[PDB]
Amino acid sequence: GPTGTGESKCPLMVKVLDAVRGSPAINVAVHVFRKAADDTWEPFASGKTSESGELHGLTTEEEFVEGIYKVEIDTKSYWKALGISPFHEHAEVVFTANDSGPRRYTIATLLSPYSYSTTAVVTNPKE
Amino acid sequence: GPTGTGESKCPLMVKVLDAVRGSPAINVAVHVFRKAADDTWEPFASGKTSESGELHGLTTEEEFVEGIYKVEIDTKSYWKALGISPFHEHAEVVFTANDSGPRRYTIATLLSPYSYSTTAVVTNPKE
Amino acid sequence: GPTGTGESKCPLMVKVLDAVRGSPAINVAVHVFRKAADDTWEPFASGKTSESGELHGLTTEEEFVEGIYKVEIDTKSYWKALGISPFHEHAEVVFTANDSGPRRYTIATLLSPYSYSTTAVVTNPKE
Amino acid sequence: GPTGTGESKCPLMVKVLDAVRGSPAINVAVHVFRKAADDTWEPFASGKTSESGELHGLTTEEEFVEGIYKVEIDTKSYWKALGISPFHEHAEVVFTANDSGPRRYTIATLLSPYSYSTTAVVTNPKE
């Protein structure tokens, strides 16, 4: 499996599932951005989901400081490849990372052509 | 104001949506059961969703006494008629109704071939 | 039949539900943007959900031309007012509208503190 | 972590998530049934979700033959423990296992007090 700008202890993991085929959503492009000082989105990390529909190694604990992050999932390209016309241009998830709460962030997203559900699982101690 | 096997203030409404087509789920069979004194499921009401994906008139305030109800949605027939072999046999929703007085219940379900989401909206009579 | 910054045949409706309370999400701020010629997001319409968790009258058929729209839902304010610190900053829905003629769009979103599901219902004008 | 009536190659895995707390749903009771010849549900396996919100070792490949299965999740007890009043009595998932399709079944369910989403991921070659 590929990675990102941080194959180490994994503070941020992305998982994408397909609700039409009941499978991992493979080779979906994912871009991560950090909100900058000027209220702009700064490229942060990116990759393509693996065979298991996951993306790890996006970052390291050292680099993943408190701030606002955006995860963008290119859902439109995914459906087009399957020959299904989708509604959304992409799926976006925007959240604050706080040092206070748990330390590992899993963003899981379930895709259908006209709908998506996204959830966050935030946990401590490795897993 | 009650009636008795029709539709009061419309105490029980079912709404079904299709996440693949981005439309109401039309002509979906719905069966409702009530838990009997003997712990068995007794037939309570049935119908099919309309062109708007809604099912009203299942019951009346008078007939819809306190109890445990099961709303069964025939999702399998729905997908097969579209040419898709789905994962689930049906979607079932089981809940206690009216145990603190009469309420109006909306059961909304979003359908995908390998996934479904169901939510309830409960309100306190009067308009 | 069109108008121009009001509500046609009601081409754009937003509905927000609360999965924690089993009720409409009331007084939720919604902002809509349209992608400008210069690739920037231009303010298009705004409002707050009603007691039924709906927002109508954002636009008219005449004003709602072909384009890429972004519906931003202020979920964070909603949860904080309930005493809950949620995960997301907001929920955003991005879609191309009317690129094959005028359509009516319903954007329905179900909210949980760490999760949300969004679906679109698209219909072909006339009643 | 506990198991069931089959800690071996894992043909059926259950995962439960909490949408209010953004965590694994721990110590949730799960009962699995197989539809018998008389149209009755036969106890098949059971357990409690682990710290990661998962249940493995429910069965073995030898025992998991084609047929209709029901997974019942005691969601009501889970919310009561948290001091939250829930809508549903439990969450039920009913599906056919077919030797034809993929061989590993993951049933993932996301819980809120008034809503749940369930999806199936069906895959081949181990993971």
How many residues can be counted in chain D? 127
β-strand partners of C94: C70
β-strand partners of B78: none
Of C71, C59, C66, C72, which Cα lies nearest the Cα of C10? C59
Contact list in C for residue D110 (CB cut-off 8 A) is 115
Q: Which of D19, D87, D115 sits opposite C114 (nearest CB)?
A: D19
A91, A75 contact by CB (below 8 A) = yes
β-strand partners of B70: B33, B94
Contact list in C for residue B22 (CB cut-off 8 A) is 119-122
Q: Do D114 and C87 touch (CB under 8 A)?
A: no
β-strand partners of A69: A34, A95
Contact list in D for residue B116 (CB cut-off 8 A) is 117-118
Q: Do A92 and C94 touch (CB under 8 A)?
A: yes
Structure token digits, residue C40: 């920037």
Distance CA B45, CA A40 (A): 56
* Helix, strand, coil percentages in chain C from 3-state DSSP, rounded to 5: 5, 50, 45
Of D122, D125, D127, D6, which Cα lies nearest the Cα of D59? D6
Distance CA C102, CA C56 (A): 17
Distance from CA of C2 to the nearest CA of B (A): 23
Q: CB neighbours (10 Å) of residue B71?
A: 24
Please identify which residue in the block is written with the tokens 């079944």. D105
Which secondary-structure segment (H or E) carries C68? Answer: strand C67-73
Distance CA C95, CA C67 (A): 8
Distance CA A26, CA D119 (A): 17
Residues 6+ apart with CB under 8 A from C109: C14, C15, C16, C17, C73, C91, C93, C116, C117, C118
B114, B91 contact by CB (below 8 A) = no
Q: CB neighbours (10 Å) of residue B47?
A: 16
Q: CB neighbours (10 Å) of residue A53?
A: 22
Of D17, D32, D40, D49, which Cα lies nearest the Cα of D94? D32
Structure token digits, residue D16: 């439960």
Method: X-ray
Residues 6+ apart with CB under 8 A from C59: C5, C6, C7, C8, C11, C12, C32, C44, C45
Distance CA B110, CA C120 (A): 11
Distance CA D95, CA B90 (A): 8
Torsion of CA D20, A92, B109, D85, to 10 degrees: 10
Distance from CA of C97 to the nearest CA of A (A): 9
A110, C106 contact by CB (below 8 A) = no
B117 — alpha (psi -120 to 50), left (phi > 0) or beta? beta
For A68, counting Cβ atoms within 10 Å of its Cβ (0-12 exposed, 13-18 middle, 19+ buried), the class is middle
The amino acid occupying position A108 is A
Resolution reading in Å: 1.7
Residues 6+ apart with CB under 8 A from A98: A66
For D116, counting Cβ atoms within 10 Å of its Cβ (0-12 exposed, 13-18 middle, 19+ buried), the class is buried
Task: Write b or e for each residue in C39-62: b if 16 or more Cβ atoms lie within 10 A of its Cβ, otherwise e.
Answer: eebeebbebebeeebbbeebbbbe
Q: Which of C110, C121, C123 sits opposite B119 (nearest CB)?
A: C110
CATH architecture of C1-127: Sandwich (2.60)
A85, A99 contact by CB (below 8 A) = no
Q: What is the largest CA-CA distance in chain B?
A: 44
Distance CA D25, CA D51 (A): 8
DSSP reduced 3-state for C75: helix
Task: Write b or e for each residue in B23-40: b if 16 or more Cβ atoms lie within 10 A of its Cβ, otherwise e.
Answer: bbbeebbbbbbbbeeeee
E strands of chain D, at which residues? 12-18, 23-24, 29-35, 41-48, 54-55, 67-73, 91-97, 104-112, 115-123
Structure token digits, residue D58: 């429910």
What are the extents of the domains in chain C? Answer: 1-127
B56, B7 contact by CB (below 8 A) = yes
Q: Which of A22, A110, A113 sits opposite B87 (nearest CB)?
A: A22
β-strand partners of D65: none
Distance CA A83, CA A77 (A): 10
Q: Which of A95, A116, A121 sits opposite C118 (nearest CB)?
A: A116
DSSP state of D101: S
Mark out chain B residues that contact chain C at CB-CB < 8 A: 17, 19, 22-24, 108, 110, 117, 119-123
